[PDB]
PDB file of C-alpha atoms in Angstrom:
ATOM      1  CA  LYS A   1      97.069  74.390  67.432  1.00 29.63           C
ATOM      2  CA  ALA A   2      96.239  77.037  69.861  1.00 31.59           C
ATOM      3  CA  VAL A   3      93.916  79.223  67.792  1.00 31.10           C
ATOM      4  CA  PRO A   4      92.848  83.027  68.350  1.00 30.86           C
ATOM      5  CA  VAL A   5      89.193  83.185  69.734  1.00 30.45           C
ATOM      6  CA  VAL A   6      86.941  86.285  69.123  1.00 28.73           C
ATOM      7  CA  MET A   7      83.572  87.002  70.244  1.00 29.84           C
ATOM      8  CA  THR A   8      80.652  89.108  69.473  1.00 29.21           C
ATOM      9  CA  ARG A   9      77.690  89.768  72.033  1.00 27.35           C
ATOM     10  CA  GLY A  10      74.078  90.591  71.062  1.00 26.68           C
ATOM     11  CA  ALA A  11      74.373  89.282  67.260  1.00 28.36           C
ATOM     12  CA  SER A  12      71.348  88.091  65.658  1.00 27.56           C
ATOM     13  CA  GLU A  13      73.310  87.476  62.443  1.00 28.94           C
ATOM     14  CA  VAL A  14      77.037  86.390  61.818  1.00 31.06           C
ATOM     15  CA  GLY A  15      78.993  85.837  58.858  1.00 28.95           C
ATOM     16  CA  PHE A  16      82.353  84.079  57.786  1.00 28.55           C
ATOM     17  CA  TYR A  17      84.018  84.795  54.543  1.00 28.36           C
ATOM     18  CA  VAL A  18      86.706  82.809  52.953  1.00 25.38           C
ATOM     19  CA  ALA A  19      88.911  83.056  49.644  1.00 25.08           C
ATOM     20  CA  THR A  20      92.118  80.843  49.637  1.00 25.99           C
ATOM     21  CA  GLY A  21      94.140  78.833  47.104  1.00 28.86           C
ATOM     22  CA  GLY A  22      93.987  76.008  49.676  1.00 26.76           C
ATOM     23  CA  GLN A  23      91.093  75.642  52.310  1.00 26.64           C
ATOM     24  CA  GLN A  24      90.033  77.319  55.715  1.00 24.96           C
ATOM     25  CA  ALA A  25      87.324  76.290  58.070  1.00 27.99           C
ATOM     26  CA  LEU A  26      85.188  77.704  60.651  1.00 25.15           C
ATOM     27  CA  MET A  27      84.498  77.069  64.401  1.00 26.47           C
ATOM     28  CA  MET A  28      81.616  78.625  65.971  1.00 24.91           C
ATOM     29  CA  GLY A  29      80.220  78.559  69.565  1.00 24.33           C
ATOM     30  CA  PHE A  30      78.214  80.144  72.375  1.00 24.21           C
ATOM     31  CA  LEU A  31      79.054  81.453  76.011  1.00 28.56           C
ATOM     32  CA  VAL A  32      76.392  80.922  78.434  1.00 32.53           C
ATOM     33  CA  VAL A  33      76.386  83.108  81.457  1.00 30.53           C
TER      34      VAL A  33
ATOM     35  CA  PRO B   1      82.600  78.058  75.502  1.00 32.55           C
ATOM     36  CA  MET B   2      80.207  75.347  73.842  1.00 31.76           C
ATOM     37  CA  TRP B   3      81.505  74.680  70.346  1.00 34.33           C
ATOM     38  CA  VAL B   4      78.973  73.424  67.714  1.00 34.59           C
ATOM     39  CA  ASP B   5      78.891  70.098  66.537  1.00 32.83           C
ATOM     40  CA  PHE B   6      77.790  70.541  63.247  1.00 32.88           C
ATOM     41  CA  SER B   7      78.278  66.824  62.526  1.00 33.75           C
ATOM     42  CA  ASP B   8      75.622  65.817  64.832  1.00 35.70           C
ATOM     43  CA  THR B   9      72.837  65.518  62.422  1.00 34.37           C
ATOM     44  CA  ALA B  10      70.542  64.738  65.281  1.00 33.72           C
ATOM     45  CA  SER B  11      70.464  68.418  65.765  1.00 33.89           C
ATOM     46  CA  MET B  12      70.348  69.355  62.362  1.00 35.41           C
ATOM     47  CA  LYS B  13      67.388  70.150  59.903  1.00 35.81           C
ATOM     48  CA  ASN B  14      66.849  70.859  56.315  1.00 36.06           C
ATOM     49  CA  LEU B  15      70.129  69.837  54.799  1.00 37.27           C
ATOM     50  CA  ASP B  16      70.676  69.664  51.132  1.00 38.75           C
ATOM     51  CA  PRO B  17      70.950  66.985  48.826  1.00 39.38           C
ATOM     52  CA  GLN B  18      74.497  66.206  49.308  1.00 38.60           C
ATOM     53  CA  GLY B  19      73.993  66.488  53.149  1.00 39.47           C
ATOM     54  CA  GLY B  20      75.439  69.852  53.323  1.00 41.47           C
ATOM     55  CA  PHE B  21      74.116  73.513  54.306  1.00 39.65           C
ATOM     56  CA  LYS B  22      71.830  75.472  52.120  1.00 41.48           C
ATOM     57  CA  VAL B  23      69.804  78.466  52.595  1.00 40.11           C
ATOM     58  CA  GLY B  24      67.105  77.449  55.395  1.00 43.60           C
ATOM     59  CA  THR B  25      69.261  74.654  56.854  1.00 41.17           C
ATOM     60  CA  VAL B  26      68.879  74.679  60.549  1.00 39.81           C
ATOM     61  CA  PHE B  27      70.792  73.800  63.675  1.00 41.12           C
ATOM     62  CA  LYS B  28      69.079  73.361  67.072  1.00 41.84           C
ATOM     63  CA  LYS B  29      70.503  72.201  70.290  1.00 42.54           C
ATOM     64  CA  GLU B  30      69.835  72.532  74.111  1.00 46.06           C
ATOM     65  CA  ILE B  31      73.248  73.654  74.640  1.00 51.04           C
ATOM     66  CA  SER B  32      72.977  73.914  78.496  1.00 51.30           C
ATOM     67  CA  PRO B  33      70.015  73.305  81.056  1.00 50.88           C
ATOM     68  CA  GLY B  34      67.097  75.501  79.721  1.00 46.96           C
ATOM     69  CA  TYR B  35      69.152  77.125  76.963  1.00 46.65           C
ATOM     70  CA  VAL B  36      68.542  76.480  73.194  1.00 45.89           C
ATOM     71  CA  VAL B  37      70.259  78.122  70.343  1.00 46.34           C
ATOM     72  CA  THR B  38      69.267  78.072  66.829  1.00 47.17           C
ATOM     73  CA  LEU B  39      71.488  78.571  63.742  1.00 49.28           C
ATOM     74  CA  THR B  40      69.801  78.927  60.399  1.00 48.31           C
ATOM     75  CA  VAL B  41      71.650  79.808  57.086  1.00 48.65           C
ATOM     76  CA  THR B  42      70.153  82.932  55.572  1.00 51.18           C
ATOM     77  CA  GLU B  43      72.990  83.444  52.887  1.00 49.10           C
ATOM     78  CA  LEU B  44      75.449  81.611  50.815  1.00 47.17           C
ATOM     79  CA  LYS B  45      77.732  84.496  49.045  1.00 47.80           C
ATOM     80  CA  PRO B  46      81.414  85.584  48.969  1.00 44.61           C
ATOM     81  CA  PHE B  47      82.937  88.710  50.184  1.00 42.67           C
ATOM     82  CA  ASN B  48      82.722  90.723  47.382  1.00 42.71           C
ATOM     83  CA  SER B  49      78.874  90.673  47.350  1.00 43.07           C
ATOM     84  CA  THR B  50      78.785  92.675  50.726  1.00 41.10           C
ATOM     85  CA  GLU B  51      77.958  96.196  51.694  1.00 42.36           C
ATOM     86  CA  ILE B  52      81.160  96.009  53.542  1.00 45.36           C
ATOM     87  CA  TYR B  53      83.112  95.359  50.440  1.00 43.96           C
ATOM     88  CA  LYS B  54      81.165  97.860  48.587  1.00 46.43           C
ATOM     89  CA  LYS B  55      82.057 100.669  50.978  1.00 46.73           C
ATOM     90  CA  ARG B  56      85.564  99.874  50.777  1.00 44.32           C
ATOM     91  CA  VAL B  57      86.050  99.709  47.077  1.00 46.47           C
ATOM     92  CA  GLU B  58      83.477 102.545  46.361  1.00 48.91           C
ATOM     93  CA  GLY B  59      84.938 105.796  44.919  1.00 46.57           C
ATOM     94  CA  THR B  60      88.210 103.804  43.646  1.00 48.67           C
ATOM     95  CA  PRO B  61      89.218 102.272  40.428  1.00 49.07           C
ATOM     96  CA  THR B  62      87.691  98.977  41.639  1.00 49.14           C
ATOM     97  CA  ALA B  63      84.094 100.222  42.568  1.00 48.74           C
ATOM     98  CA  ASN B  64      82.705  98.147  39.527  1.00 46.78           C
ATOM     99  CA  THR B  65      84.102  94.860  41.122  1.00 44.77           C
ATOM    100  CA  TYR B  66      81.478  94.980  43.785  1.00 44.15           C
ATOM    101  CA  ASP B  67      79.219  92.077  42.597  1.00 41.92           C
ATOM    102  CA  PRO B  68      75.928  91.679  44.805  1.00 44.76           C
ATOM    103  CA  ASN B  69      74.999  88.554  42.935  1.00 44.18           C
ATOM    104  CA  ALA B  70      78.333  86.914  43.075  1.00 43.63           C
ATOM    105  CA  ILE B  71      78.012  83.321  44.341  1.00 43.26           C
ATOM    106  CA  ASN B  72      80.041  80.682  45.964  1.00 44.62           C
ATOM    107  CA  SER B  73      82.693  80.167  43.219  1.00 45.60           C
ATOM    108  CA  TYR B  74      86.042  78.469  42.183  1.00 42.61           C
ATOM    109  CA  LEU B  75      88.722  81.003  41.986  1.00 42.93           C
ATOM    110  CA  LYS B  76      89.126  82.097  37.930  1.00 43.96           C
ATOM    111  CA  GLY B  77      91.902  80.317  36.311  1.00 44.01           C
ATOM    112  CA  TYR B  78      91.564  76.703  38.460  1.00 43.70           C
ATOM    113  CA  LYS B  79      90.791  73.698  36.809  1.00 40.45           C
ATOM    114  CA  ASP B  80      87.154  73.488  37.970  1.00 42.38           C
ATOM    115  CA  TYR B  81      86.358  77.158  37.349  1.00 42.30           C
ATOM    116  CA  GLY B  82      82.654  77.225  36.143  1.00 39.51           C
ATOM    117  CA  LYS B  83      81.837  73.847  37.759  1.00 42.06           C
ATOM    118  CA  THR B  84      79.636  74.278  40.932  1.00 42.68           C
ATOM    119  CA  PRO B  85      81.830  73.602  43.944  1.00 44.39           C
ATOM    120  CA  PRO B  86      80.411  71.135  46.570  1.00 45.94           C
ATOM    121  CA  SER B  87      77.943  72.333  49.492  1.00 48.18           C
ATOM    122  CA  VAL B  88      79.699  73.370  52.719  1.00 51.04           C
ATOM    123  CA  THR B  89      79.198  70.934  55.588  1.00 50.92           C
ATOM    124  CA  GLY B  90      80.216  69.451  58.803  1.00 45.63           C
ATOM    125  CA  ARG B  91      79.904  65.793  58.755  1.00 43.18           C
ATOM    126  CA  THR B  92      83.139  69.955  64.764  1.00 47.66           C
ATOM    127  CA  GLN B  93      83.983  72.549  62.207  1.00 45.87           C
ATOM    128  CA  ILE B  94      82.324  73.767  59.078  1.00 43.52           C
ATOM    129  CA  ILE B  95      84.204  73.822  55.744  1.00 42.81           C
ATOM    130  CA  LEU B  96      83.688  73.875  52.134  1.00 42.66           C
ATOM    131  CA  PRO B  97      85.738  70.776  50.892  1.00 46.06           C
ATOM    132  CA  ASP B  98      87.687  71.594  48.055  1.00 45.59           C
ATOM    133  CA  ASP B  99      90.551  73.992  47.259  1.00 43.92           C
ATOM    134  CA  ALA B 100      90.451  77.220  45.505  1.00 45.23           C
ATOM    135  CA  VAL B 101      87.098  78.843  46.354  1.00 44.88           C
ATOM    136  CA  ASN B 102      85.971  82.664  47.259  1.00 45.26           C
ATOM    137  CA  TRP B 103      83.034  81.383  49.482  1.00 43.68           C
ATOM    138  CA  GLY B 104      80.954  82.877  52.281  1.00 41.26           C
ATOM    139  CA  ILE B 105      77.961  82.175  54.684  1.00 36.76           C
ATOM    140  CA  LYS B 106      75.616  84.013  56.880  1.00 40.14           C
ATOM    141  CA  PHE B 107      73.606  82.703  59.618  1.00 39.93           C
ATOM    142  CA  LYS B 108      70.712  84.055  62.031  1.00 41.56           C
ATOM    143  CA  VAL B 109      71.407  83.553  65.537  1.00 43.17           C
ATOM    144  CA  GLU B 110      68.670  82.887  68.261  1.00 40.55           C
ATOM    145  CA  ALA B 111      68.624  81.554  71.742  1.00 41.26           C
ATOM    146  CA  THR B 112      66.132  80.919  74.246  1.00 44.02           C
ATOM    147  CA  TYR B 113      66.200  80.337  78.158  1.00 44.87           C
ATOM    148  CA  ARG B 114      63.221  78.513  79.422  1.00 45.94           C
ATOM    149  CA  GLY B 115      61.439  79.529  76.269  1.00 48.27           C
ATOM    150  CA  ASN B 116      62.324  83.248  76.370  1.00 49.89           C
ATOM    151  CA  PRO B 117      64.496  85.111  73.769  1.00 51.26           C
ATOM    152  CA  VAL B 118      67.606  86.112  75.149  1.00 56.27           C
ATOM    153  CA  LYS B 119      70.899  87.950  73.615  1.00 53.38           C
ATOM    154  CA  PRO B 120      73.412  85.398  72.616  1.00 51.08           C
ATOM    155  CA  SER B 121      77.139  85.569  73.089  1.00 50.38           C
ATOM    156  CA  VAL B 122      78.946  83.952  69.966  1.00 50.97           C
ATOM    157  CA  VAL B 123      82.701  83.064  69.475  1.00 52.93           C
ATOM    158  CA  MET B 124      84.304  82.031  66.234  1.00 56.40           C
ATOM    159  CA  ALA B 125      87.856  80.912  64.926  1.00 59.34           C
ATOM    160  CA  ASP B 126      89.441  79.615  61.846  1.00 56.85           C
ATOM    161  CA  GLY B 127      90.331  75.784  62.459  1.00 54.51           C
ATOM    162  CA  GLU B 128      92.820  75.820  59.432  1.00 55.96           C
ATOM    163  CA  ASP B 129      96.286  77.859  59.206  1.00 57.21           C
ATOM    164  CA  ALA B 130      96.898  80.361  56.792  1.00 53.56           C
ATOM    165  CA  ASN B 131      99.487  82.258  54.838  1.00 52.58           C
ATOM    166  CA  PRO B 132      99.292  85.686  53.084  1.00 52.79           C
ATOM    167  CA  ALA B 133      96.370  85.607  50.554  1.00 51.76           C
ATOM    168  CA  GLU B 134      94.482  82.813  52.734  1.00 48.17           C
ATOM    169  CA  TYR B 135      91.650  85.005  53.540  1.00 46.16           C
ATOM    170  CA  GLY B 136      89.402  84.505  56.611  1.00 46.43           C
ATOM    171  CA  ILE B 137      86.870  87.086  57.580  1.00 46.77           C
ATOM    172  CA  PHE B 138      84.340  87.193  60.232  1.00 44.78           C
ATOM    173  CA  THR B 139      81.285  89.800  60.417  1.00 43.50           C
ATOM    174  CA  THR B 140      78.895  90.665  63.049  1.00 45.83           C
ATOM    175  CA  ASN B 141      75.760  92.632  63.446  1.00 46.77           C
ATOM    176  CA  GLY B 142      76.050  92.699  67.356  1.00 47.74           C
ATOM    177  CA  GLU B 143      78.684  94.328  69.554  1.00 47.14           C
ATOM    178  CA  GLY B 144      82.383  94.728  68.329  1.00 45.41           C
ATOM    179  CA  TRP B 145      84.538  91.720  68.376  1.00 45.68           C
ATOM    180  CA  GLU B 146      86.657  91.023  71.533  1.00 44.25           C
ATOM    181  CA  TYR B 147      89.487  88.780  71.884  1.00 45.82           C
ATOM    182  CA  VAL B 148      88.957  86.243  74.367  1.00 46.34           C
ATOM    183  CA  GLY B 149      91.882  84.024  74.169  1.00 43.37           C
ATOM    184  CA  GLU B 150      93.051  81.023  72.277  1.00 42.25           C
ATOM    185  CA  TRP B 151      91.723  77.266  72.527  1.00 43.95           C
ATOM    186  CA  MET B 152      94.280  74.484  72.679  1.00 46.10           C
ATOM    187  CA  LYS B 153     104.802  89.757  69.338  1.00 47.40           C
ATOM    188  CA  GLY B 154     101.731  87.954  68.533  1.00 48.83           C
ATOM    189  CA  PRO B 155      98.943  85.982  69.925  1.00 49.50           C
ATOM    190  CA  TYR B 156      97.994  86.455  66.144  1.00 50.76           C
ATOM    191  CA  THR B 157      99.259  88.863  63.616  1.00 49.41           C
ATOM    192  CA  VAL B 158      97.443  90.948  61.243  1.00 51.47           C
ATOM    193  CA  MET B 159      97.918  90.171  57.221  1.00 51.39           C
ATOM    194  CA  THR B 160      99.033  93.109  55.230  1.00 52.58           C
ATOM    195  CA  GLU B 161      99.672  93.926  51.309  1.00 51.34           C
ATOM    196  CA  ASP B 162     103.531  94.200  52.213  1.00 49.35           C
ATOM    197  CA  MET B 163     103.180  90.884  53.688  1.00 48.83           C
ATOM    198  CA  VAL B 164     101.441  89.500  50.591  1.00 47.92           C
ATOM    199  CA  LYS B 165     103.463  91.181  48.216  1.00 48.20           C
ATOM    200  CA  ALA B 166     106.253  89.164  49.666  1.00 50.30           C
ATOM    201  CA  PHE B 167     104.762  85.745  49.571  1.00 50.49           C
ATOM    202  CA  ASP B 168     103.738  86.222  46.046  1.00 50.23           C
ATOM    203  CA  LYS B 169     107.146  86.506  44.935  1.00 49.63           C
ATOM    204  CA  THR B 170     107.827  83.248  46.380  1.00 49.65           C
ATOM    205  CA  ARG B 171     105.050  81.102  44.782  1.00 50.30           C
ATOM    206  CA  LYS B 172     107.450  81.163  41.609  1.00 49.50           C
ATOM    207  CA  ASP B 173     104.683  80.447  39.442  1.00 48.27           C
ATOM    208  CA  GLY B 174     102.770  83.499  41.119  1.00 44.99           C
ATOM    209  CA  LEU B 175      99.944  83.244  43.330  1.00 43.43           C
ATOM    210  CA  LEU B 176      96.917  81.817  41.629  1.00 38.79           C
ATOM    211  CA  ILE B 177      94.387  83.686  43.966  1.00 39.33           C
ATOM    212  CA  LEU B 178      95.814  87.062  42.527  1.00 39.23           C
ATOM    213  CA  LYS B 179      95.498  86.515  39.074  1.00 42.17           C
ATOM    214  CA  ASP B 180      91.885  86.993  39.178  1.00 41.35           C
ATOM    215  CA  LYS B 181      91.991  91.135  38.885  1.00 42.34           C
ATOM    216  CA  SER B 182      88.054  90.845  38.782  1.00 40.42           C
ATOM    217  CA  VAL B 183      88.144  91.268  42.599  1.00 45.83           C
ATOM    218  CA  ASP B 184      90.298  93.710  44.680  1.00 45.30           C
ATOM    219  CA  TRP B 185      92.081  91.181  47.159  1.00 40.38           C
ATOM    220  CA  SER B 186      93.794  94.317  48.560  1.00 40.25           C
ATOM    221  CA  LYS B 187      90.450  95.257  50.161  1.00 39.30           C
ATOM    222  CA  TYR B 188      89.933  91.744  51.648  1.00 39.94           C
ATOM    223  CA  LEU B 189      92.753  92.771  53.894  1.00 38.01           C
ATOM    224  CA  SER B 190      91.503  94.639  57.010  1.00 39.36           C
ATOM    225  CA  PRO B 191      92.004  98.162  57.062  1.00 41.61           C
ATOM    226  CA  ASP B 192      92.716  97.860  60.952  1.00 42.55           C
ATOM    227  CA  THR B 193      96.300  97.298  60.842  1.00 41.17           C
ATOM    228  CA  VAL B 194      96.959  97.646  64.382  1.00 40.56           C
ATOM    229  CA  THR B 195      94.554  94.981  65.534  1.00 39.11           C
ATOM    230  CA  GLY B 196      92.744  92.911  62.914  1.00 42.31           C
ATOM    231  CA  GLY B 197      89.433  94.565  63.659  1.00 42.95           C
ATOM    232  CA  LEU B 198      88.724  94.292  67.436  1.00 42.62           C
ATOM    233  CA  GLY B 199      86.195  96.975  68.477  1.00 44.28           C
ATOM    234  CA  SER B 200      84.510  96.479  65.344  1.00 42.81           C
ATOM    235  CA  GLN B 201      81.991  94.295  63.315  1.00 44.94           C
ATOM    236  CA  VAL B 202      84.759  92.808  60.998  1.00 47.11           C
ATOM    237  CA  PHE B 203      87.453  90.840  62.223  1.00 50.82           C
ATOM    238  CA  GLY B 204      89.530  91.002  58.979  1.00 53.47           C
ATOM    239  CA  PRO B 205      92.020  88.239  57.838  1.00 54.09           C
ATOM    240  CA  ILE B 206      94.499  87.176  60.269  1.00 52.60           C
ATOM    241  CA  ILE B 207      97.756  84.743  60.337  1.00 54.29           C
ATOM    242  CA  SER B 208      97.871  82.194  63.018  1.00 55.26           C
ATOM    243  CA  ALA B 209     100.978  81.592  64.953  1.00 54.42           C
ATOM    244  CA  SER B 210     103.669  78.959  64.751  1.00 51.11           C
TER     245      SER B 210
END
């Protein structure tokens, strides 16, 4: 329940791909400086 | 780190018949004073349709398995294979609400300050947990992925074929996902075995801690 978080700066396109016997899910957010 | 409330329909527009996401569907919200982000779905296809996949599988016995017209599907040899799965959706977390699917989604990302375009910084994470062969990949077209901590050796560990071969010999009946030899699941693994692809544009499948 502590999940690893990665970031990309300067993206205008961003993708998420899943293949699983079960189910996965996506959280997405922004950093504002 | 402002996470996106994909449930807040007041910020969403152009949702599909099932209230989920389709191409053209848009999330738009003032995330902080002056600052507006706009996420628009540009694509709903799985990983085996990507250039990234294409380059990985190219010039190897599984090149022919690149399929640019693949759609979001049930895994072959599962009880609903050929039935069209449900729309992806929020209604704090986006998820395709049904088991045994090879899917994917792309978003256009835009951001404004006081009405002027600006360079957005985006963070991503898998909400669910994953064992081997439960594959979760993140792609970007911006700067390479950096780890920024966690949200409550390892902090995470990278999924491998040695790691998947095992777990396969455990499900007893065999792992469903791997039966389907029409897709090279070996190539869903990140080739960056050290980290899972930091410094790069694709943060290939990890496994979350205990």
